[PDB]
Each structure stands twice: as C-alpha cells, then as structure tokens.
Design a protein around this ligand. Sequence first.
Ligand SMILES: O=C(NCCCN1CCCC1)c1cc(-c2ccccc2N2CCN(CCc3ccc(Cl)c(Cl)c3)CC2)nc2n[nH]cc12
Ligand SMILES: C[S@@+](CC[C@H](N)C(=O)[O-])C[C@H]1O[C@@H](n2cnc3c(N)ncnc32)[C@H](O)[C@@H]1O
Ligand SMILES: [Zn+2]
Ligand SMILES: [Zn+2]
Ligand SMILES: [Zn+2]
Length: 429
Amino acid sequence: GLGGLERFCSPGKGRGLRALQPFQVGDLLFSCPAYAYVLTVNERGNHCEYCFTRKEGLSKCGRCKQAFYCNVECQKEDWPMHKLECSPMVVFGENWNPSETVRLTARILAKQKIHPERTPSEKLLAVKEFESHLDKLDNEKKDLIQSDIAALHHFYSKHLEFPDNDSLVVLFAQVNCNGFTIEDEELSHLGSAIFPDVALMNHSCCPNVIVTYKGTLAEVRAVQEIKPGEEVFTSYIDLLYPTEDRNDRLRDSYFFTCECQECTTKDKDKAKVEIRKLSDPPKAEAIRDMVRYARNVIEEFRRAKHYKSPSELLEICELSQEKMSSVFEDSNVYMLHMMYQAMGVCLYMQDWEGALQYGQKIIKPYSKHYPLYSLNVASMWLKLGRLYMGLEHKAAGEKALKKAIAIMEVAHGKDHPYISEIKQEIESH
Ligand SMILES: O=C(NCCCN1CCCC1)c1cc(-c2ccccc2N2CCN(CCc3ccc(Cl)c(Cl)c3)CC2)nc2n[nH]cc12
Ligand SMILES: C[S@@+](CC[C@H](N)C(=O)[O-])C[C@H]1O[C@@H](n2cnc3c(N)ncnc32)[C@H](O)[C@@H]1O
Ligand SMILES: [Zn+2]
Ligand SMILES: [Zn+2]
Ligand SMILES: [Zn+2]
C-alpha cells in the first residue's frame, strides 16, 4: 500500500482512505499514475497523447494524422493504446465518433489483456474491485450503458475480446462511478482517466484534500490539517451550489446522499441563494418559483450551447439574469452560473473586455461560497489575471496572478509546472 495511509471500512461509505500520520495543508499524501487515460479530441495537437505535455511543435502520427507526440519515444510508448484508434479513425472516417467514456473503457479492456496483474496505480484499490451500483441502475441509465456497449463493439472489435453484456454493464457502471476528467490550470477539459487508488477516497462537501494533475499523474494534497485516524475526503462535485443541488447531483451520478458538516448544517445555503432586501420582501412562494426557473435555465443553456449562436447564448444569460435579479442578489449562485456561462461565451468570441467585466462580478462571491482552497476560485483568479495582462492592465494582472498562485501552491504544489508558467507570465509583462 501507500506510506502513512491505509484502506479501511468507512461506516455507511463502503471502503475509504484513512491517515496513519499527520498531514499539514499543502502536503502531498500520494501520487497515482494513470491506469488508463485518453486525451480529449478537441485537445489533439495541443498536448502530447502519451504524457499530456502542453507544447508547440508536436510530431503528428503519419498514419492517422490525428495523434500528436513530443517525439518518437512518446509515440512508441502510446502505440499499445493508440493502435485501438489509429487505423479505425481513417477507415470509419467521418463516421468515427465513440464517446470519451467508450474511448477510455476500450483502453481499460486493452490494459487488462496486456497487464492482468495488479499495477502501481492499484496499491490499495484494484480496477476489478470498483463499486458499480449495478443494482441501483434505472431504465434511463441502463439504456445509456447499452448505447456505450453498442459503440464499444462498433468501433473497438479489432483488438479486443469482449466479455458478455452483463460484464460490460458492470464495467461501464464502474467507469461512471470511478472515472476522472483531467482539467488544466483554467479547469478546461483535457481528457479522461482511471486513477484506482485516487478512486478509493470518499466524498465530502468540506474536503480535506484536493486532486490535481501533473501530465497524466494524479496528485493528492491536503487543504486542511489531517490527523491519524481521520478519513481522507475529496469533493466529487462543484461546491458552489446549495445543499439540495449538491445532493441531487451526488444521488444522480454517485447514488448516495452526503451527510458532511456542510450538508447537515446547510450554513452556506442562505448566502448562496441570497434574496434582494427590498420594500415588501419577496414571498417564500416567489423564491421557490425563481429557484425552479433558475434550475430550468441552467438545463436550457446547457442544451442550447450545442446548436445556438454566441449572440443567442449571451441573450439567454442576459435575459435570465434580468428576470432573476428581481428576486435574487448578484452574489446569488444562480446569477453567478449565468455570468460564468456568459464569460465563457465572451472568451470563445475573443471579446476579452466582455469576459473581464463578467469575471470581475464573479470573483468576490466565488471566494465567499467556495472552501478556503478551491480550484474554481484559483482558476477564476488566473483567468482574470491573464485578461488584465492581455488588456495591458499589468498591476491588476500581477495582483490576480499572485492570488491564483497562493491557492495553487497549496493545491498543485509549489514546484508545479503551471506555477512556473504563471511566474514566467508575471516576468514577461
Ligand atoms: O472527474 C470528474 N468528477 C470529479 C470527481 C470524480 N471522482 C472519481 C472517483 C469518484 C468521483 C468527472 C469524471 C467523469 C467521467 C470520467 C471518466 C469516465 C466517465 C465519466 N463520467 C462519469 C459521470 N457520468 C454522468 C452520468 C452518469 C452517471 C452514472 C451512470 Cl451509471 C451513468 Cl450511465 C451516467 C458521465 C461519465 N465525468 C465527469 N463529468 N463531470 C465531472 C466528471
Ligand atoms: C469512487 S467510489 C469511492 C470509494 C468507495 N467507497 C468504494 O468502497 O469503492 C464512490 C462511491 O463511494 C460511495 N461514497 C463516497 N462518498 C460517500 C459519502 N460521503 N457517503 C456515502 N457514500 C459515499 C458511494 O457509493 C459512491 O458512489
Ligand atoms: Zn510526450
Ligand atoms: Zn495514428
Ligand atoms: Zn456534503
């Protein structure tokens, strides 16, 4: 196993990770190399397929022209995994579209055939031992898994010997329960991976650890002091939202209800759903209605970004904020979500001024709603800093870049390449 830690039976939480020694804020508890991993399609050409290094001048795979590498070594090392997609991409052509979940599951199957023995990524929890929640699956989820199984057979039958359908619904449910997405310093999606020992950790809305990535390596660092005997908890979800919203997401994606201090006390719920203080305050029924509206526009926008124009997307943000502002304060998390979505539309449109004015309204409430060390508030400071720097506002930029570094030093470690990059950005301008 891992030094200073141990696997244990967490009452009402199945298996978990327990500390056998003290850990201070910013200490690295452990690292876990990716068992299986996949670079997201939209990041091809930007990062090396094998090690996830973000570099200019990456070598293109001559066969498929859709895999990029640091050099010939990264290329040869990725071939046992790349071989699953190389020829299929050119033969299926435009028809090649398996979901990221399917791309990852294919590599797990390939890894199980090549390396059946326990890997260095499985010191405490093995891939085969993963929780699946098979018995909890409803018709909607079973249908989704069946769509994934059909795509797995459709695109990856060349090198893989598949187990029966029942073993594959168990596998896909394990991947849903235990899979990780890898994000960059701005929380932008890079890919998906399997980190078995990292999947041992249970959830808390007040976590004592944070997971970050150093290429394909997962790193676990304390964001609170951890004493011997204490369970080590990470957050599975976005902690901006009130208790009900967090537990709806936790029940839906992870089949459990959280009972952490935050969910029990609901301390942050009041400010998260802050109401405008006005002559004749809004009635309880007016609040519940606005909240119902808010959750519906979130869903509406999520669907809309796939097919609506950037001006239509901003229109939804601006109009929903207008309707909500009659009842809701600007610091209210539903206003924040729409402002964050509007900021993203500006960034894509390269409207740096527009992005900056949204970010400026988001950062103070973010700090108030998120825990002391948070990747979401670090990433927002970083975005804000780069916007200021880009728009020639160097003093405001250096200040925001340093605010981001202060959180990142705890979460990513002092020596993290993302911090060396940000420091080079402070140096240059
Ligand atoms: O890293 C992520 N979250 C942080 C905490 C992760 N840790 C890791 C150990 C504990 C928590 C994260 C991972 C994934 C991810 C990565 C790989 C494969 C499938 C992934 N997804 C899983 C969720 N699924 C949603 C719908 C669903 C749910 C259950 C079922 Cl059964 C079905 Cl059918 C469909 C979609 C696929 N995705 C994500 N999205 N947002 C966030 C996501
Ligand atoms: C990635 S696994 C974590 C390790 C898991 N406990 C095991 O024994 O394999 C995620 C699953 O653990 C359970 N879990 C995690 N955090 C929990 C919590 N705070 N309360 C209850 N169950 C939790 C849920 O069943 C969830 O789907
Ligand atoms: Zn590389
Ligand atoms: Zn290729
Ligand atoms: Zn909680």
